[PDB]
Amino acid sequence: AIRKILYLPDERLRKIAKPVETFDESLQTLINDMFDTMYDARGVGLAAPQIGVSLRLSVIDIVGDKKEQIVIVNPEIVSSHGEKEFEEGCLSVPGAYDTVVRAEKVTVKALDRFGKPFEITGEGLLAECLQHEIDHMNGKLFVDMLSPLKRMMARRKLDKFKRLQARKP
Ligand SMILES: [Cl-]
Ligand code: NI
Numbered sequence: 001a002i003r004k005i006l007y008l009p010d011e012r013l014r015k016i017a018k019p020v021e022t023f024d025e026s027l028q029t030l031i032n033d034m035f036d037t038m039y040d041a042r043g044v045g046l047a048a049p050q051i052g053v054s055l056r057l058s059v060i061d062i063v064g065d066k067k068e069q070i071v072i073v074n075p076e077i078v079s080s081h082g083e084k085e086f087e088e089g090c091l092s093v094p095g096a097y098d099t100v101v102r103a104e105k106v107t108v109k110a111l112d113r114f115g116k117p118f119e120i121t122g123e124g125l126l127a128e129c130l131q132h133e134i135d136h137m138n139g140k141l142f143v144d145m146l147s148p149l150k151r152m153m154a155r156r157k158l159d160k161f162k163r164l165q166a167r168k169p
Helices: 025-040 124-137 148-167
Strands: 045-047 057-060 070-081 084-088 098-102 105-111 117-123
Touching (some): 025 045, 025 057, 045 124, 057 124, 070 117, 070 124, 084 124, 098 124, 105 124
Antiparallel strands (some): 045 057, 057 070, 070 105, 084 098, 105 117
16 A cells, blocks of 8 residues: 655656546555555655656645545646745655745646546645646656755755665664
């Protein structure tokens, strides 16, 4: 159920994910496994490329209490407003946190986990998460937006995290 999260520089994180074409039982299992993986990592969003599945699919739970689980399949940004700084991290760049600029408000259209079209508008953390998720589906990671010095620092923190995990029994 709980799948391993991939870390930079895994090239599977850099692929352009393919649209979901088939809503079958395997897709529901994938969605359920992604939720389990996201909750285990104590995250609020997870994109399929982050577990090695090259599909334009993400799961979201902003509050964390499973009361409003969001699944976005084949999302497209229909509109956005404003631009502001966010202090941001990423489950696929563990240990590295920095400031990036994204839209302040975004409206996304997608299919839900059963294929029904819906639209969602977000501000704050939800807006940040939606844009971060779509970036993952396009092979983009937040460190790509940083200065060379800050990207180098992020990689150093990531490498320290990896070394620490490898020392565990
Ligand atoms: Cl993430
Ligand atoms: Ni991420």
